[PDB]
């Protein structure tokens, strides 16, 4: 049977710098590197002396 089964089974220079700066601007700079969305609106509403700047 094993014999039968076995019989059955047998049967150049500046392109690199350009691509580097492209990859850098693509995946290194816009990677969530700043926090201003609260300080900006906070100091934009202080009427230090009318109408507030954010109101304008």
């Amino acid at each position: 049977x094993x014999x039968x089964x076995x019989x059955x089974x047998x049967x150049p220079r500046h392109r690199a710098v350009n691509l580097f700066l492209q990859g850098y601007e693509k995946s290194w700079i816009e990677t969530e590197e700043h926090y201003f969305e609260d300080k900006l609106i906070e100091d934009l509403a202080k009427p230090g002396a009318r109408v507030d700047p954010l109101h304008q």
Binding site: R15, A16, V17, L19, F20, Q22, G23, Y24, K26, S27, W28, I29, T31, E33, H34
Partner: protein
């Protein structure tokens, strides 16, 4: 300067891995990047270190200088 130090290092690692061949089933997977994967995604995949570790090649020395330059750019900008 970064590309000058990166391209020659990539070519050097390619030549070294070609002299020390040790033909196996993984060498083809390692060297498909050289022929396939045009330079765009090549540079995309050889420039990625923001997490703890990725498949960055052997030139780890330039990673630190790139981090220093990036911090210099951040401090030149308004980022503290």
């Amino acid at each position: 300067d970064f590309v000058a130090k990166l391209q020659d290092n990539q070519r050097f690692r390619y030549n070294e891995v070609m002299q020390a061949l040790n033909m196996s089933a993984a060498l083809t997977a390692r060297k498909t990047r050289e022929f396939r994967s045009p330079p765009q995604e090549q540079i995309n995949m050889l420039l990625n270190f923001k997490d703890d570790k990725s498949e960055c090649p052997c030139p780890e020395e330039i990673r630190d200088q790139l981090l220093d330059f990036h911090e210099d750019l951040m401090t030149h900008c308004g980022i503290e």
